[PDB]
Symmetry: D3
Subunit: 167 residues, 6 copies
């Protein structure tokens, strides 16, 4: 089952339940019916998840699916691992005509990112790398998405607080 | 960790709960009570599993252990992840008196194997490396294992059913 | 571990419930309110654990924390992997405030260590490589640790049945 | 490091000197003068090569660089190792004005691919992931690349010859 | 390296000829009488190099040895990999007998460090993680090292053209 | 080309030019016509080289092929890497009716094996693991071999000195 919480200070520090460790071509997903890790699909192209992709406990990103969070990690964690994350941005894209934003966060417990606190704290090539990833990783799956851009911490925190109360 | 079902439409597609990620030399089993991961043993020889090995939920085979399944995976998965596998063959092997059969399943969610529906679609070398592995991976342990051969998907599934029925 | 017999033989055949697989730089920890894997920190230096690091269920060690056990593995397992271990020694050190004793062990089901029963059977340098490890990993984090030395197997097996009963 | 020949019997089997081991995100090229490994660049997107990429010794193609070869390898090899590859197809792609074609070769010394003689033997998904990779792996860099398609082994080899003849 | 232009721009665009890929615990070295890769030693502690470690061809540094350069790479290369680097700093330390200065650099052809030119652009903790590294790796081998601190990019670029000419 | 030497003290310490790093399923081989690494074959079975397999510079194991040496290494080296090796045993087997012995050595520069100097210094499960490997790794290649056993250092040193003078 799951019943864990959104995290400590909330908009400030949040919990990140990881499903896909950086470097994976295999896209996993936490099962709601079981609570165990299940294989969603193997990316049709040689893309490797650029970050530790996961969700934030008990959040409701409109309808259904929890709010997804991308944690920058210098060494991938294992699926189903909880991370205390400091949001720093909001990746904004539209899939089937709808907003499909995601929280770009960073690890609290890794001094490397101690002074990282807002998109303008992340080299641009990286952001473009995460962006270029969602833009093409499902293309062979007959899906194309429209990318809008990013937003800083506040928007992130802003969306999180919401997604949570919406939950 | 067995409150889950044998999978989607049982015959044609089942769930494979992995225990051993491809390329591993540590042999992990799914603990009875706990459900958690258990270091079964460290193979006595420099072999690494050539597939993702695991079990089909809610199934019981001849010996008296879950029906084992082998999912051919390009990139290994983590012990305990669920996988929607499509059987394509049955591995017949006898471990020390026990009729220890295994299913050869492929990922439903990887196009690479889009046209791997039956044992006749698998490169004969791969099948060969698979039987050789079991044929010998225990030799040092003292257990001698005889290999019998292969059977296609239909067989695989016929056995899947029977295993499900034996859980009860 | 919420519930799990400490080990099937005691003294000897003990149950090691790994948290940090050898080779890892991410220091993981097990939470009791959840039972899920949780990222605790990221070693501030480029240090990688020299052994799988775990704990013995249903134990209690003087500081309140469980009983830490270092299993010596060739190929690292996965966090939450239950390993039937077998303590061949005890590593004495103090995180500066209450002694923090780790239990050096060897996995059964691996003929490789067939003849490993005391720290005397353990190559010296290795033993050292560990000593240095704790005597130096947190240092960077502005913290010190007093590493005395090692104690025998029976020694370890002593502090062990203590804690396994101390409940 | 090019005193070596195009390979055994040139058409049917060539040598492939690898530069990029499968699964790598760092792009390595074979330095002109030195011969030694050169970090060409770090791909701008989370792509990892899906094959062992390298060059056919003593060959020169249209653009003005060695004829490139792709060896499908289960377990990647080290940059600079030689491999006896068996072509089975030709990848047609145009990089910024240049007719940048590549050979699709398989290992002679891996039974797994025993029956991979032509492009029709390759799982269509794999071929698809291959073209998608080139089609986009440079997008961020500013270079836009158009993909043209595939041709079988005969084609591959016809081009191998021509490349050899252009070295001279 | 028997022969190879130190780098195409000097000051800046320098030629780094890696010996020990980041992540490695085997300390490799390049032999001049052969030019082949050679195992030099195995760090006595479970330390793994934090960066690809190399040297600048056709240089000479006060002790007779070449000029060491630490490139900061995301994915490690392979020994004998020529990387067009770019020194953003200088790491000052002394192996106890003659100062041993390393040259912290950043690879070009990796937009990620697009804006890395001085140690000020380098996350602090990281810089530290290195400092600790040398200030602690050989210790176990009954040896000490005096780690002062870091110096700027121009600082590094200075000691550099020294050695590149000192021949 | 190659022209390197057998090693330092000779029967005592020897050089090991590695072709196949521990963990490889891919069997490589140093090319005599080129001197570059070439792929011999990919093992027909999921065996992974148990050790760093290689050759000793300028040795003549009867006809042709250089004397092969197996170095025990806790972390694999890269192909074409030179290692100073301390012989400790002779693996004895017969392939096509002939002796096809190999030198089992150990790394000088890794304190872990400081006190390893003779087969009786290597856990037995390991020796049986190396042995079981050659016994079956070419079976699917229609070849079966006959395994005789091992011999200690002196035999090794004895065979090396010979193989060299024979060269």
């Amino acid at each position: 089952f799951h019943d864990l919480e959104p995290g400590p200070n909330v908009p400030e520090v949040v919990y990140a339940l990881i499903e896909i460790p950086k470097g994976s071509r295999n896209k996993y997903e936490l099962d709601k019916e079981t609570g165990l890790l299940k294989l969603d699909r193997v990316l049709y192209t040689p893309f490797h998840y650029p970050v530790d992709y996961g969700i934030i406990p008990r959040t409701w990103y409109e309808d259904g699916d929890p709010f997804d969070i991308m944690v920058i990690m210098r060494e991938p964690t294992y699926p189903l691992t909880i991370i205390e994350a400091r949001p720093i941005g909001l990746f904004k894209m539209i899939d089937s005509g709808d907003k499909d934003y995601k929280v770009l966060a960073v690890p609290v417990e890794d001094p490397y990112f101690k002074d990282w606190k807002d998109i303008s704290d992340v080299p641009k090539a990286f952001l473009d790398e995460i962006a270029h990833f969602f833009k093409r990783y499902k293309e062979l799956e007959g899906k194309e998405i429209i990318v809008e851009g990013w937003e800083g911490a506040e928007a992130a925190k802003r969306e999180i607080l919401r997604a949570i109360e919406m939950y």
